[PDB]
Every structure is written in structure tokens, then in C-alpha cells.
């Protein structure tokens, strides 16, 4: 295994949280975005005309993605194509963290570059609740 991520803002949920890095550098600061559509990242975001590319001078985008329906590596690949700088997969149930693994089936696996991590449903819901309230959610990854 378990690593760390730091929600730097807002104050309501800021702090250090456990996470499990995907089984597939330096410090990285980004801003969290929960997409309106395609929340499980099983289809291409360009089908929805959704991009996570950051405008010049602004924080890179960490996309929050729900667990389910497709492989974790496809989620990371689809988010990477949409321009995300990292992917956080919120677990679909409240349980201990698991290590996202390669599909084994039975590339693009050698072409996945963005950092990947699975977080708890509790932290996933807390992040979504802060974004729904109108606050930006910033985060620091030191892996």
C-alpha cells in the first residue's frame, strides 16, 4: 503493498490517504475530475467529446473513475488517451484495498504510462461529495 496520496485541498477532506498502485517519475500534483459520463472508462472518452487535457499553466487532471465492467488496464488506457495525467479507481464496495492486476488474457499494456491507483469507496465518495459542493480537489502523488 500500500502507498500514500495526499489530498491537499479543500480543508474539509485534506489529508493523507491509503491507496494501492496498479500493477502495470517523481512527485506529481494534480486536480481531480469526476466525469459527467462514461464514469467507468470502458469506452473512449472522445465518443463523448470529453477531454482531460489541462490548459497551459493549470494543474494536470487526475480522473476519478468507478470500478466495474472492464479491466483496470483498459480504464487506465482510456483515461490516458483522453489526456489524464493519472487515474484513481474508486472501489465499488467498502472493503480492504486490492492490487489492480494485468488482464492476463491473450499489446497496449506496454503503452500504459500514467500513474494508476485504487482507492476506497469511502474516499471515492468523499472526493465526489467535495466536487459536487463546488470545491476543486487537489492531490499530490509521491510514488
Amino acid at each position: 503493498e500500500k502507498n500514500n496520496l495526499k489530498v491537499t485541498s479543500p480543508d474539509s477532506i485534506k489529508g493523507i490517504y491509503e491507496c494501492a498502485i496498479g500493477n502495470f517519475g517523481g512527485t506529481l500534483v494534480g486536480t481531480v475530475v469526476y466525469p459527467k459520463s462514461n464514469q467507468k472508462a470502458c469506452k473512449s472518452y472522445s465518443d463523448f467529446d470529453i477531454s482531460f487535457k489541462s490548459k497551459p499553466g493549470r494543474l494536470p487532471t487526475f480522473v476519478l473513475i468507478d470500478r466495474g465492467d472492464c479491466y483496470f488496464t483498459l480504464k487506465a488506457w482510456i483515461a490516458q488517451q483522453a489526456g489524464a495525467a493519472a487515474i484513481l479507481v474508486a472501489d465499488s464496495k467498502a472493503e480492504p484495498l486490492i492490487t489492480m492486476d494485468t488482464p492476463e488474457e491473450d499489446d497496449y499494456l506496454q503503452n500504459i504510462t500514467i500513474p494508476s491507483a485504487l482507492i476506497t469507496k469511502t474516499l471515492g465518495d468523499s472526493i465526489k461529495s467535495a466536487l459536487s459542493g463546488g470545491d476543486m480537489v487537489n492531490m499530490k502523488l509521491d510514488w
Binding site: 500493477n23 470500478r67 466495474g68 465492467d69 472492464c70 479491466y71 483496470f72 488496464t73 480492504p96 484495498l97 486490492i98 492490487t99 489492480m100 492486476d101 494485468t102 488482464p103 492476463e104
Partner: peptide, 5 residues
């Protein structure tokens, strides 16, 4: 605990 999906 390890899983692919």
C-alpha cells in the same frame, strides 16, 4: 488481494 477488474 489481486484482481484484474
Amino acid at each position: 488481494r489481486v484482481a484484474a477488474a
